[PDB]
Amino acid sequence: LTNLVAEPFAKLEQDFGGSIGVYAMDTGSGATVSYRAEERFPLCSSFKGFLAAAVLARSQQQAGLLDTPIRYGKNALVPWSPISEKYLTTGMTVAELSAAAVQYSDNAAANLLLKELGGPAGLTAFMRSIGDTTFRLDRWELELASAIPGDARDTSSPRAVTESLQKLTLGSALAAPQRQQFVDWLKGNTTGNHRIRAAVPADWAVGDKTGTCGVYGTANDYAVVWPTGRAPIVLAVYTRAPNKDDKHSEAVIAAAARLALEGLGVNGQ
């Protein structure tokens, strides 16, 4: 049930000038589409979705964690912190920081939550606890986004991303209220309109988390998609390219998502 119908991913990545990695899972039948799915790609900001899930998991054992007010100084305000910069003089709650990290890819929020979990190793430990042996986070924002060719730091594979996303949004890795909160944060993401969402018809529900490194043509998106009348689809699309100055492409991510849905036989656009 893997790649029952071949799709022209190779042509797509050649036109892009780099590598595209795709893993898509039909959670009804278990059928999959897979292209470079076990290669490592930089997570970039896409780690922030798993970060929020790790916070939610901790909130199962610490009641009131999400309501905790967090104060921070100007030195916490990393570039691209569009929400946390507006609350510098007031602070934000853990839940607000988590929503900002997921929905606006807020870097200061992400680093504040990373510190709450014990740093990159703490997030990595959470991923190990759900059975993901591929994920590794090694650094903080923005150093984690160097996207160096061949560097395994701050990477995962499209397959491991999809498998973990399925466990967290649809499976049993989170308790039911925390699972729906994670889904609701992903549904409210504002940064992904030109990526997987551009391949998903307007009448289907969808949540996603993007990542964009800014170098080495490196960008990505993962999503859970609910086509009407059938089981949800989980998918991950990651890209990279050989040269530091190579540009990423949102259109290539959307096109790869379209091919994945076509390969799964999901009638879409």
Side-chain angles (χ1 to χ4, degrees):
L1 276 70
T2 309
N3 300 325
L4 292 176
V5 170
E7 301 290 345
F9 288 115
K11 181 175 85 220
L12 187 64
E13 71 182 353
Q14 287 160 23
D15 291 342
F16 168 62
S19 297
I20 302 167
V22 176
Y23 197 75
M25 172 191 320
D26 182 340
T27 68
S29 62
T32 54
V33 165
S34 177
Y35 187 81
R36 300 191 186 279
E38 296 85 21
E39 294 186 27
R40 283 185 175 280
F41 291 78
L43 286 158
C44 314
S45 302
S46 77
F47 87 92
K48 293 167 187 162
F50 295 118
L51 178 68
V55 172
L56 287 167
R58 186 177 289 251
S59 80
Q60 291 171 207
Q61 298 301 109
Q62 327 185 14
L65 172 63
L66 298 175
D67 278 351
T68 295
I70 303 299
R71 306 183 48 217
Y72 47 93
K74 187 161 130 174
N75 59 337
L77 287 184
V78 190
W80 192 253
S81 301
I83 306 304
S84 56
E85 71 185 2
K86 307 309 183 197
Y87 298 84
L88 168 69
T89 53
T90 67
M92 297 163 76
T93 69
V94 167
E96 295 177 319
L97 290 169
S98 298
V102 173
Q103 309 175 325
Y104 290 86
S105 214
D106 193 292
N107 279 322
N111 280 350
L112 288 164
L113 295 167
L114 269 181
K115 198 190 154 63
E116 190 92 11
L117 309 156
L123 182 54
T124 299
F126 171 71
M127 296 302 284
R128 296 289 179 270
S129 82
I130 71 175
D132 184 333
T133 57
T134 309
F135 179 100
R136 58 185 292 186
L137 201 74
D138 295 80
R139 289 171 296 173
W140 304 70
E141 288 284 9
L142 306 159
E143 298 71 35
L144 63 80
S146 51
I148 293 163
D151 186 356
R153 289 179 300 169
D154 313 285
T155 63
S156 194
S157 68
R159 172 159 182 184
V161 169
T162 293
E163 289 172 338
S164 290
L165 185 63
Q166 185 204 13
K167 292 169 182 173
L168 293 164
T169 59
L170 298 170
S172 73
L174 296 171
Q178 286 81 11
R179 182 184 40 259
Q180 190 59 53
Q181 178 62 268
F182 186 42
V183 165
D184 288 349
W185 283 337
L186 293 167
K187 286 178 160 194
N189 179 36
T190 73
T191 69
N193 289 343
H194 305 293
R195 294 181 193 193
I196 293 167
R197 282 169 188 267
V200 170
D203 67 319
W204 300 0
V206 62
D208 72 313
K209 178 73 196 85
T210 59
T212 310
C213 277
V215 287
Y216 291 104
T218 296
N220 54 63
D221 196 22
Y222 59 78
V224 184
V225 176
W226 287 265
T228 68
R230 61 185 295 158
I233 310 300
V234 188
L235 74 164
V237 179
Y238 280 68
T239 76
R240 67 181 127 76
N243 296 313
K244 194 173 186 165
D245 83 339
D246 277 352
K247 295 310 190 53
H248 75 276
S249 170
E250 298 200 284
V252 168
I253 294 170
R258 291 192 192 99
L259 290 181
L261 291 174
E262 268 152 11
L264 289 175
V266 179
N267 181 240
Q269 307 172 331

